Structure formats: C-alpha cells, structure tokens
Design an enzyme around this catalytic site. Structure first.
Site, PDB file in Angstrom:
ATOM      1  N   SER A  45      43.428  39.305  38.653  1.00  0.00           N
ATOM      2  CA  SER A  45      43.439  40.978  38.293  1.00  0.00           C
ATOM      3  C   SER A  45      42.719  41.560  39.770  1.00  0.00           C
ATOM      4  O   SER A  45      42.806  42.790  39.464  1.00  0.00           O
ATOM      5  CB  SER A  45      42.840  41.051  37.075  1.00  0.00           C
ATOM      6  OG  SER A  45      43.662  40.852  35.866  1.00  0.00           O
ATOM      7  N   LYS A  48      45.075  44.082  41.273  1.00  0.00           N
ATOM      8  CA  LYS A  48      45.420  45.449  40.804  1.00  0.00           C
ATOM      9  C   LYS A  48      44.910  46.803  41.487  1.00  0.00           C
ATOM     10  O   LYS A  48      45.725  47.538  41.717  1.00  0.00           O
ATOM     11  CB  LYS A  48      44.897  45.736  39.128  1.00  0.00           C
ATOM     12  CG  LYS A  48      45.444  44.792  38.446  1.00  0.00           C
ATOM     13  CD  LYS A  48      45.226  44.872  36.895  1.00  0.00           C
ATOM     14  CE  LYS A  48      45.820  44.148  35.855  1.00  0.00           C
ATOM     15  NZ  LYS A  48      45.770  42.656  36.014  1.00  0.00           N
ATOM     16  N   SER A  92      42.268  45.630  32.726  1.00  0.00           N
ATOM     17  CA  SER A  92      43.037  44.564  33.242  1.00  0.00           C
ATOM     18  C   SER A  92      44.530  44.315  32.770  1.00  0.00           C
ATOM     19  O   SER A  92      44.861  43.095  32.431  1.00  0.00           O
ATOM     20  CB  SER A  92      42.477  43.357  33.516  1.00  0.00           C
ATOM     21  OG  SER A  92      40.848  43.476  33.899  1.00  0.00           O
ATOM     22  N   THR A 183      36.903  42.873  37.732  1.00  0.00           N
ATOM     23  CA  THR A 183      37.031  41.421  37.256  1.00  0.00           C
ATOM     24  C   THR A 183      38.196  40.879  37.477  1.00  0.00           C
ATOM     25  O   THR A 183      39.261  41.671  37.662  1.00  0.00           O
ATOM     26  CB  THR A 183      36.585  41.460  35.800  1.00  0.00           C
ATOM     27  OG1 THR A 183      37.774  41.828  34.956  1.00  0.00           O
ATOM     28  CG2 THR A 183      35.382  42.505  35.395  1.00  0.00           C
ATOM     29  N   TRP A 185      40.076  36.781  36.227  1.00  0.00           N
ATOM     30  CA  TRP A 185      40.344  35.435  35.371  1.00  0.00           C
ATOM     31  C   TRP A 185      41.335  35.158  35.550  1.00  0.00           C
ATOM     32  O   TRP A 185      42.482  35.344  34.826  1.00  0.00           O
ATOM     33  CB  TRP A 185      39.552  35.760  34.217  1.00  0.00           C
ATOM     34  CG  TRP A 185      39.228  34.179  33.462  1.00  0.00           C
ATOM     35  CD1 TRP A 185      39.732  33.062  33.974  1.00  0.00           C
ATOM     36  CD2 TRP A 185      38.482  33.974  32.414  1.00  0.00           C
ATOM     37  NE1 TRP A 185      39.066  31.927  33.064  1.00  0.00           N
ATOM     38  CE2 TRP A 185      38.265  32.541  32.248  1.00  0.00           C
ATOM     39  CE3 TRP A 185      37.602  34.936  31.686  1.00  0.00           C
ATOM     40  CZ2 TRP A 185      37.544  32.041  31.207  1.00  0.00           C
ATOM     41  CZ3 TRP A 185      36.854  34.203  30.491  1.00  0.00           C
ATOM     42  CH2 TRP A 185      36.636  32.846  30.522  1.00  0.00           C
ATOM     43  N   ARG A 225      30.164  36.621  34.289  1.00  0.00           N
ATOM     44  CA  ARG A 225      30.417  37.107  35.609  1.00  0.00           C
ATOM     45  C   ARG A 225      29.370  38.332  36.107  1.00  0.00           C
ATOM     46  O   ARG A 225      28.821  38.344  37.034  1.00  0.00           O
ATOM     47  CB  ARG A 225      31.867  37.698  35.937  1.00  0.00           C
ATOM     48  CG  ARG A 225      32.724  36.258  36.098  1.00  0.00           C
ATOM     49  CD  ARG A 225      34.240  36.570  35.870  1.00  0.00           C
ATOM     50  NE  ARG A 225      34.439  37.599  34.695  1.00  0.00           N
ATOM     51  CZ  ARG A 225      35.829  38.147  34.278  1.00  0.00           C
ATOM     52  NH1 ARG A 225      36.860  37.813  34.927  1.00  0.00           N
ATOM     53  NH2 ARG A 225      35.807  39.063  33.251  1.00  0.00           N
TER      54      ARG A 225
HETATM   55  C1  LIG Z   1      45.042  39.830  33.838  1.00  0.00           C
HETATM   56  O1  LIG Z   1      45.926  38.980  34.979  1.00  0.00           O
HETATM   57  C2  LIG Z   1      43.650  39.151  33.977  1.00  0.00           C
HETATM   58  C3  LIG Z   1      43.197  39.597  35.274  1.00  0.00           C
HETATM   59  O2  LIG Z   1      42.832  38.533  35.957  1.00  0.00           O
HETATM   60  C4  LIG Z   1      43.011  39.684  32.690  1.00  0.00           C
HETATM   61  C5  LIG Z   1      42.476  38.618  31.763  1.00  0.00           C
HETATM   62  C6  LIG Z   1      41.019  38.234  31.912  1.00  0.00           C
HETATM   63  S1  LIG Z   1      40.141  38.392  30.462  1.00  0.00           S
HETATM   64  C7  LIG Z   1      40.714  39.661  29.178  1.00  0.00           C
HETATM   65  C8  LIG Z   1      39.948  39.920  28.002  1.00  0.00           C
HETATM   66  N1  LIG Z   1      40.244  41.130  27.488  1.00  0.00           N
HETATM   67  C9  LIG Z   1      40.491  42.003  28.536  1.00  0.00           C
HETATM   68  C10 LIG Z   1      39.353  42.917  28.803  1.00  0.00           C
HETATM   69  O3  LIG Z   1      38.246  42.617  29.548  1.00  0.00           O
HETATM   70  N2  LIG Z   1      39.302  44.046  28.184  1.00  0.00           N
HETATM   71  C11 LIG Z   1      38.367  45.105  28.219  1.00  0.00           C
HETATM   72  C12 LIG Z   1      40.162  44.325  26.970  1.00  0.00           C
HETATM   73  C13 LIG Z   1      40.700  41.017  29.898  1.00  0.00           C
HETATM   74  C14 LIG Z   1      40.641  39.247  32.840  1.00  0.00           C
HETATM   75  C15 LIG Z   1      39.240  39.532  33.377  1.00  0.00           C
HETATM   76  O4  LIG Z   1      38.642  40.283  32.597  1.00  0.00           O
HETATM   77  O5  LIG Z   1      38.853  39.023  34.294  1.00  0.00           O
HETATM   78  N3  LIG Z   1      41.652  39.971  33.291  1.00  0.00           N
END
Ligand SMILES: *[C@H](O)[C@H](CO)[C@H]1C[C@H](S[C@H]2CN[C@@H](C(=O)N(C)C)C2)C(C(=O)O)=N1
EC number: 3.5.2.6
Length: 239
Positions: A45, A48, A92, A183, A185, A225
């Site tokens: 992510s 982005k 994200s 962030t 993941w 993180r």
């Molecule tokens: C999307 O490709 C990916 C980016 O690398 C998303 C998934 C993970 S965690 C996920 C948990 N719920 C979302 C969030 O933080 N909110 C506020 C709803 C994201 C991720 C990440 O946070 O690294 N991005």
C-alpha cells in the site's frame, strides 16, 4: 540515538526489520536486520502515494471525487462505503486505488513509474495489482528517498499535486511536530512485508524522512509498525 537500543526494540518485538532515516540527504540505518535496506520488496500500500500522484497529475481523478461503493464485499468492512481518494488513502482501501489504476492504464502507468524511477520500475502486464504481488519492487532506502522528495515537493510532478497528496498523509500532530506516513502490509507474500514510510516535520520546519520495513506475521497487531517507529524516533530524539 544509539544504533543498538533500536536493535533491542526490533529484537524484543520478534521480527526482522530496518528503519531507514534520511536527514537532509544523509541516510542512516537502524534495526536488527540492516541488510534489508538494499533488498527489494513489494511496495504494497505504500504505492498508493505514487498512484495518487500519477492519477491527480494526469487528471484521471481529483481530490473531491467520491468513489462509489457498488456493494461487493471487501476485505475490511470500513472499506464498504463511498469515499474520496484521501479517505481511501487513510484506510489503505485498495479497491479505490485499483479502480484509479485501471483509469490510468498500463501504458501511462509504466511510463510514469519509469520516469520517476520507483524501485525496479517494472509493472508487468496487470495494471491493477503489480504493486501487491509483483513484479514491482522497491528497497527501503529507495522508499525513504522517494518519500523525502515528496516531503520537499521535489518529485517530478506539479507542486499542487504533491501538496495534495502530502495532505492525504497526515498521521499525528504532537509536541508541535507532524508525522506524515503511509502504512503497508503485504499479507500474501511470505515472509509478509510491513512498511511504514513517511517523514517528521519538526517545528523549526526541518524534514527528516523515514522508511520502516520489517518482516511480518498474521497475529501481530497493526500498531506494531507505529510502536516500533515512535519509540525509535524518540530514542533518536527526532520527536
Ligand atoms: C492494501 O493493499 C493493504 C496495503 O498494503 C492494506 C491492508 C493492511 S491492514 C488493513 C487493516 N484495516 C485497514 C486500516 O488500517 N484501516 C484504518 C481500516 C488496513 C494495510 C496496512 O495497514 O498496512 N493496508
């Protein structure tokens, strides 16, 4: 800022990671796996940031457009709503950014990714996932230099588009400081890659960019993180 107390932070949390700090074009390495700083990983992510820059700059979207949720179930229920690019940025919310990527298209994307020189600058054939499972990959020093340029408005995009994207990335105001970051993941790749790339905007105006990168696992809490980043940045006394 001892290059070893930070090690006990990564040692403790049980992981393999690096924290890359760039202060005025000087790069320092911290963590328990400094070798990760020059190894390529999927940007997940964190891409982005570039995706938004390409999309705004090329008028495929704008910061007020509301992306409509057409009712398919998505991976997290907070993604199941209408949102702008900026809200999608903070959640994200990859389906918004994949629809943006399809608008941009392969040719425009590959030409922009190569013009910026992001990571290995390879996107392959599928416009809507090359940043999540390959072939695009980037080292953590390259991420800190990318995000550093963005903080200084130095990337090869118009200033107003860069400023628009920076204002999408605000994470914390504290002690008169500002931490911006993205962030990341990648939960499908093994080992899983965790990203937290951004910068600190100290009250004097000084900018210090960071790219935290670490191996990840499914049970860890998302805050792992930020935890590893904040207690470090204060140990180097950046915050
Ligand atoms: C999307 O490709 C990916 C980016 O690398 C998303 C998934 C993970 S965690 C996920 C948990 N719920 C979302 C969030 O933080 N909110 C506020 C709803 C994201 C991720 C990440 O946070 O690294 N991005």
């Amino acid at each position: 800022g001892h290059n070893q107390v930070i090690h006990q932070y990564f040692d403790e949390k049980n992981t393999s990671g690096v924290l890359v700090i760039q202060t005025d074009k000087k790069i320092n390495l911290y963590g328990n796996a400094l070798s990760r700083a020059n190894t390529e990983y999927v940007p997940a992510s964190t891409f982005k940031m570039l995706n938004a820059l390409i999309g705004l700059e090329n008028q495929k979207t704008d910061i007020n457009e509301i992306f409509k949720w057409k009712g398919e179930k998505r991976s997290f229920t907070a993604w199941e709503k209408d949102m702008t690019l900026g809200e999608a940025m903070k959640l994200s919310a990859v389906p918004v950014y994949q629809e943006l990527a399809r608008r941009i298209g392969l040719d425009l994307m590959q030409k922009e990714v190569k013009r910026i020189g992001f990571g290995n600058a390879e996107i392959g054939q599928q416009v809507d996932n090359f940043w999540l499972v390959g072939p695009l990959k980037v080292t953590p020093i390259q991420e800190v230099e990318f995000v550093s340029q963005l903080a200084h408005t130095q990337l090869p995009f118009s200033e107003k588009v860069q400023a628009n994207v920076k204002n999408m990335l605000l994470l914390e105001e504290s002690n008169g400081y500002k931490i911006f970051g993205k962030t990341g993941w990648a939960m499908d790749i093994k080992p899983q890659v965790g990203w937290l790339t951004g910068w600190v905007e100290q009250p004097d105006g000084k900018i210090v960019a960071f790219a935290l990168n670490m191996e990840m696992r499914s049970e860890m809490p998302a805050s792992i993180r930020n935890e590893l980043l904040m207690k470090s940045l204060k140990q180097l006394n950046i915050i």
